[PDB]
Amino acid sequence: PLCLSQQLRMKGDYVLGGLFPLGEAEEAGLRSRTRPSSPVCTRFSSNGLLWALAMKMAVEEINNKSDLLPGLRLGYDLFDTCSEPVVAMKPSLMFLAKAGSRDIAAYCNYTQYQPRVLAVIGPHSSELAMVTGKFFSFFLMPQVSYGASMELLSARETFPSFFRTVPSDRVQLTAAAELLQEFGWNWVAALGSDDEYGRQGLSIFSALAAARGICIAHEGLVPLPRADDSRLGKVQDVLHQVNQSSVQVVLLFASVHAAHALFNYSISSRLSPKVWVASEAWLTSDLVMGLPGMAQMGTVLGFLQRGAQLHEFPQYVKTHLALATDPAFCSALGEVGQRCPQCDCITLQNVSAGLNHHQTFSVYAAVYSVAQALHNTLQCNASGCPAQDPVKPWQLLENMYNLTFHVGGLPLRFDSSGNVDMEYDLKLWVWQGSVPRLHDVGRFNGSLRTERLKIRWHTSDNQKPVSRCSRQCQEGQVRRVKGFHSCCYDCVDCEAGSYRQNPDDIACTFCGQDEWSPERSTRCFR
Amino acid sequence: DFYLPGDYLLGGLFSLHANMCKEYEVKVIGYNLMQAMRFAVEEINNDSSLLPGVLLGYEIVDVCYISNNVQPVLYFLAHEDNLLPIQEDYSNYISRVVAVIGPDNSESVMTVANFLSLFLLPQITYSAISDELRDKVRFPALLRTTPSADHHIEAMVQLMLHFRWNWIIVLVSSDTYGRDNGQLLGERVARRDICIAFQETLPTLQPNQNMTSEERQRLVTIVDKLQQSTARVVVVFSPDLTLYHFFNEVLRQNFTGAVWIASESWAIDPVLHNLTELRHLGTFLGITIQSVPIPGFSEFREWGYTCNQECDNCLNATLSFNTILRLSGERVVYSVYSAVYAVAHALHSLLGCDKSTCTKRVVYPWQLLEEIWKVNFTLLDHQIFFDPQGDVALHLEIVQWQWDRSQNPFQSVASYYPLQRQLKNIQDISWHTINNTIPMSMCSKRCQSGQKKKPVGIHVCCFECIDCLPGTFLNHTEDEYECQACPNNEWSYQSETSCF
């Protein structure tokens, strides 16, 4: 059987934590809890192990490299998360126990603490991001993550050390608000998923869109499917109100499954076409793509992450799969999750699915960010380092903010909040027939530049779907407030006789026959 | 009052400040709730029936609202030597604190519950409201003793149904308590024919802050919308220390007529009262949990090892505001009172003290959870018991704001029954109107007979009354949004629903 549990850890000198979803928890025994413990994760999640091998490759690359951390090594501390805090937190406690000792003290302060690891490569889950961030905020442990995207983990408010990769939803939502602004769309009916991801996205977009002058028509949430029934009725109601608001853009900041449910129902009821400014979660997704008859749903165009491919990762995974098979190799290595014989009894076929994924580079980048953070805090130069004293994590915290580290030739730098600065791209779902290929229409760098000549726009004569709110319209009309935020109103022309008594009423008031008053007349004139 | 030893200890995560913990702005309600827990365990000791011997001993650590939420738990469930061993199986763990009790904020509650799910050590919160806490797969050890956000939302919506407010404004905050609660209100009113006019996020500001420029313009815009929209019921969801600024220029804008349904956060907070000119803003209403005061609470209220676990000026401030706190009859104290009594009864029955003696058999936090998930006792004429989703049924209440300094700065207007899910005993409530009449808040007046109520705009609460043409009668029996022609020899005219 393949032998990987032994190699999920190396002694090195400055150990780095790892919280990855190598195995995902079965949905059977989570509910029943009559014994304090975390349910085992005997199942295998291929993408999680791909990520673990990504972290291992990162650490091996720095260790082999001379310039970074000369005369110094970093050790792995891979642990499982199963995307569940209960089975992903006690590893976090392990990460602050002690140098060797397994007990974690509860001191008032943390300066005298000398923790086991330096920086914990944060969890993929954003909920796990919240839990681990709240944990490591007190201890001031650097936690560079690789999946977190919720904007809540931005400021040094409750997460002082969360220098994540994978730029937050704030940047793509600014990009989408800019898209709506230049494309003239302001009567947008934004939508999001019923889970926390869509909730935070839609709050962010409410603020952002109001700032940009584009005001919502229906801020609604689409339930994730699970067992829909009443949630199917809720989906029906949500799309009904979207249609009855008479818009053409629905920015859908919903997870992949909520989008699948929404599109499934819409096609099942032949809902009207419209533009769907998409998230990175379903701009590139097979689930929504594979629904038959989906193509006639407007034009779908969103923003994608421009993360440079980290090649040679499939080569590295293949090399490790082949190499762990030799009995002599890892027997000497032996002389962490997914440790049972069946847990390590994987094969190339079982893991040869993700490979060229865009998050193995995220894990690479996190590891290299902590590597360069140490290099800065330990005052090492080429082929040397004074290394007088052990480094506490808060020293990294001091020297991790505003740190620029060269990864794959990309000079990623951590912003003051903690995020990273990377550009996006406007992927457009053009249809050649049953396969919506994606290609560049516009690149976002904080100032969205779109090629307007590269969008089909469905409809007829490819005219851009116009969705406009008449803000501050003529004096010859009466104003009716419309919109989830009272921004902008709908203009209604006064009828015969009905003289608008004042320019700030809800209707035009009728007068006697003594005066003659045509339409759009405020004062009855004799 | 911050430490007491005992055979079995318990811990209180009270929020003595907001905005060491002394550096933050002093908050009176934290000290009030702490004194509530104090009286709880003190009477438990005095009442030899509840627990002979094996006295409980509180261990309070100020949580500083949302700041200090993690270190107090770490101190908890750790041996006396401030050292917490880590094992895969926590079944055999002697924890000094047997059940932490009373993290206040929902975010702090969630942080504590996430930290505790490893140990299955009970956490009973006295003020957490977030609906997410009802799911007992992420927080198995998060019993709660106050109705969830869903129940406050139902109480408010049924209040507006009773007073016939089908056109309402809701302003939310920029935190979870704002967004989640406003969402719950919107989803609820969607199905009860109450229509939201517009929603505006009240900017997050501090009482000590001197405001900014963009934020000032934003709030000016908000109040302009408030004075524009015909909807005159404003339901504001926000922590207490956030309203102050917004209410300031709401007042200054001469915005007179309104009905502010106040969220549970600031439905009982006496800080906004000192504005002393809120009468001009209109009848202020709020939702809370009202209970008879603890019989002896006056004695403890007026009587003379961990980081940031002590306050400095809390006692003097509490005694100063004692006028309001006594006159208001603090009621959220009974939430923490009932939490303490639930833990006490679970611990008592687990030791099996049959009114004679206690066997001090080793106890573990998870055993206390198993025993605490089922309690049925009468505490001050109230049945305390948790529903499967870990939330007891305490009566939410509606409070109108009486400015008179004499007594009762909060008046118990409407009683809401959690289990019954109904609203009753709506005491005659004073209004800002010219004849004490109920302030109407409707998008448009209900259409008269013979006039069709054609919908206009987004919401179903807005309609303009066309008088359908001669030969057509308002077929109110079947459809009202459209007028149809009366068939047969009957031939109607303008209006005149009764087709001849």
Swiss-Prot record, chain A:
GO terms for biological process: detection of chemical stimulus involved in sensory perception of sweet taste; G protein-coupled receptor signaling pathway; sensory perception of sweet taste; sensory perception of umami taste. One of its GO terms (cellular component) is sweet taste receptor complex. Keywords: Cell membrane, G-protein coupled receptor, Glycoprotein, Membrane, Receptor, Sensory transduction, Signal, Taste, Transducer, Transmembrane, Transmembrane helix. It is a multi-pass membrane protein. It is found in: Cell membrane. Residues 506-515 are annotated as: Required for brazzein responsiveness. Changing residue 507 to P: Receptor unresponsive to all sweeteners tested. Its main location: membrane. Changing residue 507 to G: Retains partial activity toward brazzein; however response to other sweeteners tested is suppressed. Changing residue 510 to A/H: Reduces the response to brazzein and monellin. GO terms for molecular function: G protein-coupled receptor activity; taste receptor activity. The keyword Transmembrane helix applies. Residues 1-526 are extracellular. Glycans are attached at residues 64, 109, 243, 264, 350, 381, 402, 445. Changing residue 510 to L: Reduces the response to monellin. The keyword Signal applies. It comes from the Eukaryota. Putative taste receptor. TAS1R1/TAS1R3 responds to the umami taste stimulus (the taste of monosodium glutamate). TAS1R2/TAS1R3 recognizes diverse natural and synthetic sweeteners. TAS1R3 is essential for the recognition and response to the disaccharide trehalose. Sequence differences within and between species can significantly influence the selectivity and specificity of taste responses. Belongs to the G-protein coupled receptor 3 family. TAS1R subfamily. Forms homodimers or heterodimers with TAS1R1 and TAS1R2. This is Taste receptor type 1 member 3. The lineage of its organism: Eukaryota, Metazoa, Chordata, Craniata, Vertebrata. The gene is TAS1R3.
Swiss-Prot record, chain B:
The keyword Transmembrane helix applies. Residues 1-500 are extracellular. It is found in: Cell membrane. One of its GO terms (cellular component) is plasma membrane. Keywords: Cell membrane, G-protein coupled receptor, Glycoprotein, Membrane, Receptor, Sensory transduction, Signal, Taste, Transducer, Transmembrane, Transmembrane helix. The keyword rRNA-binding does not apply. One of its GO terms (molecular function) is taste receptor activity. GO terms for biological process: detection of chemical stimulus involved in sensory perception of sweet taste; G protein-coupled receptor signaling pathway; positive regulation of cytokinesis; sensory perception of sweet taste. It is a multi-pass membrane protein. Glycans are attached at residues 46, 210, 254, 274, 316, 376, 435, 475. Forms heterodimers with TAS1R3. Belongs to the G-protein coupled receptor 3 family. TAS1R subfamily. Putative taste receptor. TAS1R2/TAS1R3 recognizes diverse natural and synthetic sweeteners. This is Taste receptor type 1 member 2. The gene is TAS1R2. The chain holds residues 26 to 552 of 839 of the full protein.
